[PDB]
Each structure stands twice: as structure tokens, then as C-alpha cells.
């Protein structure tokens, strides 16, 4: 129920690892964001210096957030597509942290991965539609915005549009073709909610990686878990703690902290370190090396 038991023998990465290899822990949900794709060459939003929010004056823009709002995008779709060309990676290579989640899947521990990212790196690492909630959509597909025809286009088609700097318009009806991402101001995909109502009824561990937990309703997921579900954050910086002035969230440090753990560093390093404790380090090394080699050969 709502009893706040202490399931981890100690609020550390080693405590989480022993819990992951006990019998109580059979369903794991990952919540991930842009931090886990920065070492794949896709920059943050809010990280000072790197993050996009510091790097977008050049966009004739009245509000550094407007380039991701649906309202602004309806009026002026060009800056987004211009920004999309800048950021489009030359090669899609998922990170160690991505591959840690594919290890979760391969070992039957992955109940679901909820991602805020739209870069398709979860799928390239081998997470299937049954494993994934792309909470903010994806670049992988695109649709005519006209309610009358909503023709679908593949990333191959959208990429050439963006690289040829020509605004994507629909071959059937000449309306705008928008990548299948959830802009700020749009409604999250239905499957987000149907998964959320069911997944969080029996998750045994939350793995929060590479997200500042500042976009809603995604950030609210950490509170859907039952009160005794251990929660591990792997992130550059602590996140998800209740504001002192503002049901609340992460509790790493207070006297009544009992299940939240913050491993601070690179998501790739933190997943490397967790895998070591689990005896998966070599297993993780071969998988990343093999898949990077396969991708490097394309």
C-alpha cells in the first residue's frame, strides 16, 4: 500500500545492485531524457553552455522556448526545421546508457522505458515498441498535418527535406509535414497514459537517467510508483526534489530519506558502474563495442 517501507539495505548504488539481483525486483521502469543522448552528440536543452537554451540567438526568436512550442511552429515552421538541420547527427550511435537498457530488456528486467527523447536512439539500441513509450513522440516518422489526409513519411524522406533546406510539404495535398514529435503545447500520445495507468501498479524499481524532471506531465511519473519502490537517479546533478515553497518527489538527503538514490556523474559512467556491480560489465562492453562496430561499418 502506502506504507513507505525501506527495501534497499543502503541508499547507494551497491544497495540498488543487490536489490536488483534479489527476488523482490522483477519489473524495472526507466525514465530517461536528453542527458542520456548528449554523449551521442545530441545536445541538452537546459545544461548551461552545451544546452540549446544557451545557443539559439541566431533564430530571429522572441522567446528561446518558442522554437519548440506548437503555436509558434504553426505560424513559422522554418526556424525549427533550420534548427533540425544544425542538430541532425551524421551517424546514429546509441550510448552505453542506451545499451544498458537493452541489457535490461535482454535479461527480462525491463517493463518499460519512458523516454522524453525524440532521437530514435532507444530503437537503434534494440528496444522495441512493446518496450518503449516515446512520451514526446519521435523523428522516426512524420505526418502531413492536414486532418484530411495525414499521410505518413519516413525519416529518410524528412531528412532530405531538412538537408535540402526545403520546408517539408505533403506530396498528396501540399500541406506541412511535421515530424512525429510532441511540441510544447501539444497533447502527449494516448499510449503514454494507458501504459502509465498499468505499468506503475507493479514496478519494483525506477531508474531515472539524464533528465532534469522539469517537463510535465513526464516528470510526474516518479510519483506514480508505489511508495516503497526504490528510485535511482543517474544524472549530472540532483533533480526531482520538491521545491521548498511548492505528492512531492525525490528525497535523497532529508532525515526521512528511505528509498531515493542519487548517483551523480555521466549516465554512461553510472550505467557502467552499475553493470560492474551486477556482473554485466563485460557483457555491456561486448554489446556496445559490437553494435558501435556494426554501425561504424554502415
Amino acid at each position: 500500500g502506502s506504507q513507505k517501507e525501506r527495501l534497499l539495505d543502503e541508499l547507494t548504488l551497491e544497495g540498488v545492485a543487490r536489490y536488483m539481483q534479489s527476488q523482490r525486483c522483477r519489473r524495472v521502469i526507466c525514465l530517461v531524457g536528453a542527458g542520456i543522448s548528449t554523449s551521442a552528440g545530441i545536445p541538452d536543452f537546459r545544461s548551461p553552455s552545451t544546452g540549446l537554451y544557451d545557443n539559439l540567438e541566431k533564430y530571429h526568436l522572441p522567446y528561446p522556448e518558442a522554437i519548440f512550442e506548437i503555436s509558434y511552429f504553426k505560424k513559422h515552421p522554418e526556424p525549427f526545421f533550420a534548427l533540425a538541420k544544425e542538430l541532425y547527427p551524421g551517424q546514429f550511435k546509441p550510448t552505453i546508457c542506451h545499451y544498458f537498457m537493452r541489457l535490461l530488456k535482454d535479461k527480462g528486467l525491463l517493463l518499460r522505458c519512458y523516454t522524453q527523447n525524440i532521437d530514435t536512439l532507444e530503437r537503434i539500441a534494440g528496444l522495441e515498441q512493446e518496450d518503449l513509450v516515446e512520451a514526446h513522440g519521435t523523428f522516426y516518422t512524420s505526418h502531413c498535418v492536414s486532418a484530411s489526409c495525414r499521410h505518413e513519411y519516413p525519416l529518410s524522406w524528412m531528412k532530405e527535406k531538412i538537408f535540402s533546406e526545403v520546408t517539408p510539404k505533403c506530396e498528396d495535398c501540399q500541406s506541412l509535414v511535421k515530424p512525429d514529435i510532441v511540441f510544447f503545447g501539444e497533447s502527449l500520445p494516448a499510449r503514454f497514459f494507458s501504459c502509465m495507468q498499468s505499468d506503475f501498479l507493479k514496478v519494483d524499481l525506477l531508474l531515472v537517467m539524464g533528465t532534469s524532471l522539469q517537463v510535465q506531465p513526464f516528470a510526474s511519473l516518479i510519483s506514480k510508483a508505489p511508495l516503497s519502490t526504490p528510485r535511482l537517479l543517474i544524472n549530472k546533478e540532483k533533480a526531482g526534489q520538491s521545491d521548498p515553497f511548492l505528492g512531492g518527489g525525490m528525497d535523497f538527503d532529508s532525515k526521512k530519506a528511505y528509498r531515493d538514490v542519487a548517483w551523480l556523474g555521466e549516465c554512461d559512467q553510472g550505467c557502467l558502474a552499475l553493470a560492474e556491480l551486477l556482473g554485466w560489465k563485460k557483457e555491456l562492453e561486448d554489446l556496445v563495442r559490437r553494435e558501435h562496430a556494426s554501425i561504424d561499418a554502415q
Binding site: 514526446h136 510535465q216 506531465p217
Partner: peptide
């Protein structure tokens, strides 16, 4: 509910 910053 919709995608919103905070």
C-alpha cells in the same frame, strides 16, 4: 494534459 515546462 499537455506538454508544459515548469
Amino acid at each position: 494534459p499537455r506538454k508544459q515546462l515548469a
